């Protein structure tokens, strides 16, 4: 009853919509490849690009470091600016369809996942970002899990509280319980081929920031 209770609460904090056509996804995917190519040309600030074995993260607008839960924003202007293509192909669409207000987004993060890549249980850092958190999926379909104890106590529990499909061209909006009161993660098994995501957020005015 506790897990079936949680699932409904999680769903209260999730809104999803298919906003980007296949043609729109293809253009955005070409732009994501341009970013990856620029990074490999050493064209971005050091704090803009975080390379890890099965995921690269690209920080535009604002970036942060990641004891525990002591993430801090970099000083303003440390990471590269949000590309014009993010503003005009992605943010503009979200603003037009009333997902978030004009002027809300000042952070765009691109996560580019290898096959087998994943996200280990985490909560979007509530001391750094406002809600809602907006995620847009590219390249391939995947699944976003909520309630990720199964990643750490496998003998005791094997399944997430909820598994949410996240398809190519889908916009996921997280707020409330889904953003603040439960962990999420991505299982290696749900990233069988390259998948990328663009995360659009608003940093808090009072967010802790390195000087």
UniProtKB/Swiss-Prot annotation:
RNA demethylase activity is inhibited following sumoylation. Inhibition is relieved following desumoylation. Fe cation binds at residues 122, 124, 184. Changing residue 184 to A: Impaired catalytic activity. One of its GO terms (cellular component) is Golgi apparatus. Residues 1-41 form a coiled coil. The modification N6-acetyllysine is found at residues 57, 153. It comes from the Eukaryota. Its main location: nucleus. Binds 1 Fe(2+) ion per subunit. Acetylated by KAT8 at Lys-153, promoting interaction with PSPC1, thereby facilitating recognition of N(6)-methyladenosine (m6A) mRNA by ALKBH5. Deacetylated at Lys-153 by HDAC7. Monomer. Interacts with RBM33; promoting desumoylation by SENP1 and recruitment to N(6)-methyladenosine-containing mRNAs. Interacts (when acetylated by KAT8) with PSPC1; interaction facilitates recognition of N(6)-methyladenosine (m6A) mRNA. Belongs to the alkB family. The C-terminal disordered region undergoes liquid-liquid phase separation (LLPS) for the formation of paraspeckle membraneless compartment. This is RNA demethylase ALKBH5. It comes from Homo sapiens. The chain holds residues 76 to 293 of 394 of the full protein.
């Amino acid at each position: 009853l506790q897990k079936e209770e949680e699932a409904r609460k999680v769903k209260s904090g999730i809104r999803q919509m298919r906003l980007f056509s296949q043609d729109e996804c293809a253009k955005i995917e070409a732009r994501i490849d341009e970013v990856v190519s620029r990074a490999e040309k050493g064209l971005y600030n050091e704090h803009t690009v975080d390379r890890a074995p099965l995921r690269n993260k690209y920080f535009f607008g604002e970036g942060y470091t990641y004891g525990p839960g002591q993430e801090r924003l970099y000083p303003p202007g440390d990471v590269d600016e949000i590309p014009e293509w993010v503003h005009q192909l992605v943010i503009q669409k979200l603003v037009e369809h009333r997902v978030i207000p004009e002027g809300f987004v000042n952070s765009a993060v691109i996560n580019d996942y290898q096959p087998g890549g994943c996200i280990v249980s985490h909560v979007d850092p509530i001391h750094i970002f406002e809600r809602p958190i907006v995620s847009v999926s590219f390249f391939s379909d995947s699944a976003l899990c909520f309630g990720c104890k199964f990643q750490f106590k496998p003998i005791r529990v094997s399944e997430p509280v909820l598994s949410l499909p996240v398809r190519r061209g889908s916009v996921t909006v997280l707020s409330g319980y889904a953003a603040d009161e439960i962990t999420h993660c991505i299982r290696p098994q749900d990233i069988k081929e390259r998948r990328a995501v663009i995360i659009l957020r608003k940093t808090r005015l009072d967010a802790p920031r390195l000087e």
